Amino acid sequence: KVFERCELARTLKRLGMDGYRGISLANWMCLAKWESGYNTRATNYNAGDRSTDYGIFQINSRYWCNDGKTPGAVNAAHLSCSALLQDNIADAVACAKRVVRDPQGIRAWVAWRNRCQNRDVRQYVQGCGV
């Protein structure tokens, strides 16, 4: 499902993402924007280390979800990467919150550093009424 900007921004707000770990909704929009353009189907293979980034937040199968194909990876006791490709983003959100409790926080996604770090991210939540 390709989301609309404000719909997503309201959705994440409902899921408790605003101010989570010191991370505004505006920053969560920025991240999702630059990671998948707001598309839940988004899948990015990483030929070099042979990993895959899944869903709206482009979660990597080596550390947080397992697809079985990834070399050097988390056991099939975890969450399946398929769960991150659904239209409903509650699970991706759940995993997202997990990823960031690690010390580096939001810096986890290099894309956020490149595009969202130390900048005015308000355009993302602009007029969404949240």
Curated annotation (Swiss-Prot):
InterPro entries: Glyco_hydro_22, Glyco_hydro_22_CS, Glyco_hydro_22_lys, Lysozyme-like_dom_sf. PROSITE patterns: GLYCOSYL_HYDROL_F22_1 (PS00128), GLYCOSYL_HYDROL_F22_2 (PS51348). It comes from the Eukaryota. Monomer. Belongs to the glycosyl hydrolase 22 family. Lysozymes have primarily a bacteriolytic function; those in tissues and body fluids are associated with the monocyte-macrophage system and enhance the activity of immunoagents. This is Lysozyme C. It is found in: Secreted. One of its GO terms (biological process) is defense response to bacterium. CDD domains: LYZ_C. It holds the Pfam family Lys. The active site is at E35, D53. One of its GO terms (cellular component) is extracellular region. It is linked to Amyloidosis, hereditary systemic 5: A form of hereditary systemic amyloidosis, a disorder characterized by amyloid deposition in multiple tissues resulting in a wide clinical spectrum. AMYLD5 primarily affects the viscera, and the predominant clinical features are renal dysfunction of varying severity, and intra-abdominal bleeding. Inheritance is autosomal dominant. PANTHER family: LYSOZYME C (PTHR11407:SF28). It catalyses: Hydrolysis of (1->4)-beta-linkages between N-acetylmuramic acid and N-acetyl-D-glucosamine residues in a peptidoglycan and between N-acetyl-D-glucosamine residues in chitodextrins. Disulfide bonds join C6-C128, C30-C116, C65-C81, A77-C95. One of its GO terms (molecular function) is lysozyme activity. Lysozyme C is capable of both hydrolysis and transglycosylation; it also shows a slight esterase activity. It acts rapidly on both peptide-substituted and unsubstituted peptidoglycan, and slowly on chitin oligosaccharides.
